């Protein structure tokens, strides 16, 4: 029951939650998928992660316009790499307020990305400092520690069973942790387990590069990351 709009695929996960999937056309290689989320919060919409490109990101917004027809209040993007912040200019062109870890914003130039307009900061226990995430509705933002990158954050959707691991979590049948070029191999396993512990009741785990999985994705990612040490 998936829907396509241009280059994007949408899947409804819950009454008020959809997964957006965008594809990098990677000369000579297969299209590479990356997933994010769209959340309807009463009379507004909230977005987690851009698509790979600005053009693809404008497609997300147009699909929202057509299928949900509520204003998009804000987006949270989950680290400074192309699949998560590639479409920043498109969000800003559309007048969507954007939030990212302060560290994502600092790293953004050196990663080729455009910084968000607002910086999230985090306590020692990983939870976002609430003053930096005003009016986030059901979005619960958690920094689990360095793993896939030093800046990677995660989001839980209150009132649902869903939590989003972004590129930190890989699916439970995975044979590898994907792109480790900017990874913290020492702390990765702890950071994956911290995500699990922050959202103990989530039973649907959404991630960047596989279809939604159960909590098995968390423990399997940790067990793989254990061997990086
Ligand atoms: O950056 C790119 O051009 C790129 C090109 C092809 C694959 C990927 C995967 C990425 B991630 O965030 O999952 O570390 S970034 C990336
Ligand atoms: Ca751009
Ligand atoms: Ca890099
Ligand atoms: Zn990445
Ligand atoms: Zn990724």
Residues 6+ apart with CB under 8 A from 106: none
What fold is seen in the domain 1-229? Answer: Metallo-beta-lactamase; Chain A (3.60.15)
Residues with CB in 5 Å of ion ligand 2: 54, 89
C-alpha count within 13 angstroms, C-beta hemisphere, residue 162: 25
Say if ligand 1 is within 6 A of residue 179 CB: yes
List the strands of the sheet with 72-77, edge to edge. Answer: 3-5, 8-14, 17-24, 32-41, 44-48, 72-77, 97-101, 118-120
Sign of CA dihedral 69, 10, 46, 109: negative
Q: Provide the annotated binding site for substrate.
A: 170, 179
Say if ligand 1 is within 6 A of residue 81 CB: yes
Q: Pairing relation of β-strands 118-120 and 139-142?
A: unpaired
Task: Tell me how far apart the alpha carbons of residues 219 and 16 are, in angstroms, rounded to a whole number.
Answer: 27
Task: Tell me how far apart the alpha carbons of residues 154 and 36 are, in angstroms, rounded to a whole number.
Answer: 11
Q: Of 11, 10, 16, 15, nearest to 137 (Cα)?
A: 16
Atom of ligand 1 nearest to the CA of 182: 14
Q: Provide the annotated binding site.
A: 79, 81, 83, 148, 167, 170, 179, 209
Which long-range CB contacts under 8 A does 110-116 form with residues at least 24 apart? Answer: 111/80, 111/81, 111/85, 111/182, 112/82, 113/80, 113/81, 113/82, 113/85, 113/86, 113/88, 114/85, 114/88, 114/89, 115/88, 116/77, 116/85, 116/88
Resolution at which this structure was determined, Å: 1.5
């Amino acid at each position: 029951g998936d829907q396509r709009f241009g280059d994007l695929v949408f899947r409804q996960l819950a009454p008020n939650v959809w997964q957006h999937t965008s594809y990098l056309d990677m000369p000579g290689f297969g299209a590479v998928a990356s997933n994010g989320l769209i959340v309807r919060d009463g009379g507004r919409v909230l977005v987690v992660d851009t698509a790979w490109t600005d053009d693809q990101t404008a497609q997300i917004l147009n699909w929202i316009k057509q299928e949900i027809n509520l204003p998009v209040a804000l987006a949270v993007v989950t680290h400074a790499h192309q699949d998560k912040m590639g479409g920043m200019d498109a969000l800003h062109a559309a007048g969507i307020a954007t939030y990212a870890n302060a560290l994502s914003n600092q790293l953004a130039p050196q990663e080729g990305m455009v910084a968000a307009q607002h910086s999230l900061t985090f306590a020692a226990n990983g939870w976002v400092e609430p003053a930096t995430a005003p009016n986030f509705g059901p979005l619960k933002v958690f920094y689990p520690g360095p793993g896939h990158t030093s800046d990677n954050i995660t989001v839980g959707i209150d009132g649902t069973d869903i939590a989003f691991g972004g590129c930190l979590i890989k699916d439970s049948k995975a044979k590898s942790l994907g792109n480790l070029g900017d990874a913290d191999t020492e702390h990765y396993a702890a950071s994956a387990r911290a995500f699990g512990a922050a959202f103990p009741k989530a039973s649907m785990i959404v991630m960047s590069h596989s279809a939604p999985d159960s909590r098995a994705a968390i423990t399997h990612t940790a067990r793989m990351a254990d061997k990086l040490r």
